[PDB]
Design a protein around this ligand. Structure first.
Ligand SMILES: C[As](C)(=O)[O-]
Ligand SMILES: [Ca+2]
Ligand SMILES: [Ca+2]
Length: 205
């Protein structure tokens, strides 16, 4: 049952979701989600992933008056996304250990790409995946100024790069659209905390 969204209505250090499943060691991956936010200057942290010894193992964050960034092993790449206009947007980032090459997609359109992002470092396994907060400890250490304020749906992770056509299918809600083979969006796949609330969501409607 994937037809739902999570709403994070206020800036707090206590509202979050925990994904029940952890991540394997990933030499490449794609992360995608639908999100909506009117928060400014920055939307905060839609998701973060911490492992022992590195709480910033995989992070998506737009913090204050700074641009939206992906962090891998606490190394930054600035992303092209502009998504805090109060309308729904779909985003994906694909990345590979091979020369640290990444691509960024907004609303089904590839709109940025770069290299030398945490090259040669597979994503480390067995950490804690949180939605709506940035981690400074394993599964915690939240900071309200970094918290996501807005709505999130259809959070998915695959341990490969999706093709541009596969991303297009996600962003247009095609019947061909895939679910994540590592993390897939379902109510029973997450735990919610602190005031985050679940509502029905009909994507592309
Ligand atoms: C300095 As930080 C992004 O780990 O709160
Ligand atoms: Ca952190
Ligand atoms: Ca922090």
């Amino acid at each position: 049952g994937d037809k739902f969204q999570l709403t994070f209505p206020l800036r707090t250090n206590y509202m979050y979701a925990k994904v029940k499943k952890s991540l394997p060691e990933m030499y490449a991956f794609t992360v995608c989600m639908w999100l909506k936010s009117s928060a400014t200057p920055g939307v905060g942290t839609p998701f973060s992933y911490a492992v022992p010894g590195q709480a910033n193992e995989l992070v998506l964050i737009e913090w204050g008056n700074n641009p939206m960034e992906i962090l891998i092993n606490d190394k930054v790449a600035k992303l092209p996304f502009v998504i805090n206009d109060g309308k729904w947007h779909h985003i994906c980032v694909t990345w590979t250990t091979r020369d640290g090459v990444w691509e960024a997609y907004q609303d089904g359109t590839q709109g940025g790409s770069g290299e030398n992002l945490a090259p040669y470092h597979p994503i480390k396994p067995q950490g804690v995946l949180v939605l709506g907060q940035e981690q400074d400890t394993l599964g915690g250490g939240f900071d309200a100024t970094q918290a996501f304020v807005g709505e999130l749906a259809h959070f998915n992770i695959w341990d490969r790069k999706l093709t541009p056509g596969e991303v297009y299918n996600l962003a247009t809600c095609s019947t061909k659209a895939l679910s994540g083979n590592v993390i897939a969006w379902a109510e029973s796949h997450i735990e919610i905390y602190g005031g985050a609330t679940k509502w029905t969501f009909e994507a592309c409607r």
